Amino acid sequence: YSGRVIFCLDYIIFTLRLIHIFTVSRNLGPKIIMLQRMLIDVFFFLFLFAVW
Amino acid sequence: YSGRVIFCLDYIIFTLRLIHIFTVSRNLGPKIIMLQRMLIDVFFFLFLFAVW
């Protein structure tokens, strides 16, 4: 069961790597580039929301 | 029943054609023009969301 869990983790991280590949296309590359920074800022905002 | 399904599809596509007619009015023409591009970009964003 632990190996199965680790395999699920491997699957999700492999999907993350797949997401990296899409950056080449002009259509959805800038979208991901923006998404990263938005994710950072949203993480900080959610941290503050979490605290109160 | 298959003919009924096809008739429902015909109805929805006819409503799409009706939506095309509204473009003439200045009030809600630019709205539809914007909606098309927003739909394209949102479709790409939803594709990425779908994958992860």
Ligand SMILES: CCCCCCCC(=O)OC[C@H](COP(=O)(O)O[C@@H]1[C@H](O)[C@H](O)[C@@H](OP(=O)(O)O)[C@H](OP(=O)(O)O)[C@H]1O)OC(=O)CCCCCCC
């Ligand atoms: C389902 C999971 C994901 C599916 C795959 C989804 C992968 C995916 O979404 O990529 C789309 C990509 C779009 O290509 P893309 O339109 O960005 O290509 C550029 C674009 O056309 C620009 O408009 C061009 O500049 P401009 O107009 O002249 O100014 C530029 O030419 P240049 O200026 O540089 O000379 C072009 O290079 O198409 C592929 O070929 C990738 C091969 C993927 C192979 C797919 C195999 C299935």
Ligand SMILES: CCCCCCCC(=O)OC[C@H](COP(=O)(O)O[C@@H]1[C@H](O)[C@H](O)[C@@H](OP(=O)(O)O)[C@H](OP(=O)(O)O)[C@H]1O)OC(=O)CCCCCCC
């Ligand atoms: C319920 C399903 C949908 C219902 C129907 C809903 C259809 C619908 O929503 O259209 C609204 C439309 C609005 O007309 P609209 O206000 O855009 O007309 C233009 C507008 O008044 C601009 O302000 C004018 O420019 P400006 O001010 O001078 O700068 C321009 O004059 P010009 O500058 O070009 O000379 C005008 O042409 O009214 C109709 O006549 C369409 C006939 C529809 C007939 C309706 C029959 C029922």
